[PDB]
Amino acid sequence: KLKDFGKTVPVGIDEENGMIKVSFMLTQQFYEIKPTKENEQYIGMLRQAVKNESPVHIFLKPNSNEIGKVESASPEDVRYFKTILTKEVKGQTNKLASVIPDVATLNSLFNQIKNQSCGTSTASSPCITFRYPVDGCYARAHKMRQILMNNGYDCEKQFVYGNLKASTGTCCVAWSYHVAILVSYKNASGVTEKRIIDPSLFSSGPVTDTAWRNACVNTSCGSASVSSYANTAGNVYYRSPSNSYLYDNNLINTNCVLTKFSLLSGCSPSPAPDVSSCGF
Numbered sequence: 001k002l003k004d005f006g007k008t009v010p011v012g013i014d015e016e017n018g019m020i021k022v023s024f025m026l027t028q029q030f031y032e033i034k035p036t037k038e039n040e041q042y043i044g045m046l047r048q049a050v051k052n053e054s055p056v057h058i059f060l061k062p063n064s065n066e067i068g069k070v071e072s073a074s075p076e077d078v079r080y081f082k083t084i085l086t087k088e089v090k091g092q093t094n095k096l097a098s099v100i101p102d103v104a105t106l107n108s109l110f111n112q113i114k115n116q117s118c119g120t121s122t123a124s125s126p127c128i129t130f131r132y133p134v135d136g137c138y139a140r141a142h143k144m145r146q147i148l149m150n151n152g153y154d155c156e157k158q159f160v161y162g163n164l165k166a167s168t169g170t171c172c173v174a175w176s177y178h179v180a181i182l183v184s185y186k187n188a189s190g191v192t193e194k195r196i197i198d199p200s201l202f203s204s205g206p207v208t209d210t211a212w213r214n215a216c217v218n219t220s221c222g223s224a225s226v227s228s229y230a231n232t233a234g235n236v237y238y239r240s241p242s243n244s245y246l247y248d249n250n251l252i253n254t255n256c257v258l259t260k261f262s263l264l265s266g267c268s269p270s271p272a273p274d275v276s277s278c279g280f
Helices: 037-052 075-084 103-114 137-150 209-215 252-261
Strands: 003-008 010-016 019-024 030-033 056-060 067-072 156-167 172-186 192-197 225-233 236-239 245-247
Touching: 010 037, 010 156, 019 037, 019 172, 030 037, 030 067, 030 172, 037 056, 037 067, 103 137, 103 172, 103 192, 137 172, 137 236, 137 252, 156 209, 156 236, 192 209, 209 225, 225 236
Parallel strands: none
Antiparallel strands: 003 056, 010 019, 019 030, 056 067, 156 172, 156 225, 172 192, 236 245
């Protein structure tokens, strides 16, 4: 009766209104487990796995984000997750400019990125699923970075974490973290500034990281607060709260996730469809 969610690493466990909210690596979605006598051991397993950044096997109640069972990971699972979620930092191998020369070029890059939005005739496949804010922010950000790279530029990522909520203007989503590209450019006086580019939240253009994080704590959606943020090299696909990095150097995961979410829009389906198939 339970849905096999597969193996993953829990990265947060946070109590709210009679329910325990669990966050996992990569996915931006919250999962929940009820603090009942019968869930007491599953909850302990999750708490220990969060502490130690170790994998577990997750089973969900059908058609929900509710955890029904947690099973231990094998020594093989432990070995694998250590290889992919790593402190072994490795930077971009291609030579690129880390600073965009002027705001005109920043704006051009913004337009090129927005032109790749799913639902616009200018976009090529796989299009960037900005209109589907439920999950996949990591893939959207890596695809935005690819556009910069196609222009000869690199950038940073900013990962923001917490009890996040955002509105599309018609509906709200909840996230354990969000990520977008943080682009450095020279202003009119030649001073380097940074802006976030994130058409899933700001359709008009680049915005300050302060404004961006504020949009991730939209209290019109309910309770919200930021717990942390971290800037990373652009090549980081996902950063855990323990400062481990996951990479997607050939955009294998990125393209697979974008392809899966291509026709999705709005705040449903939630949970998002399974992208476990994707790999790297």
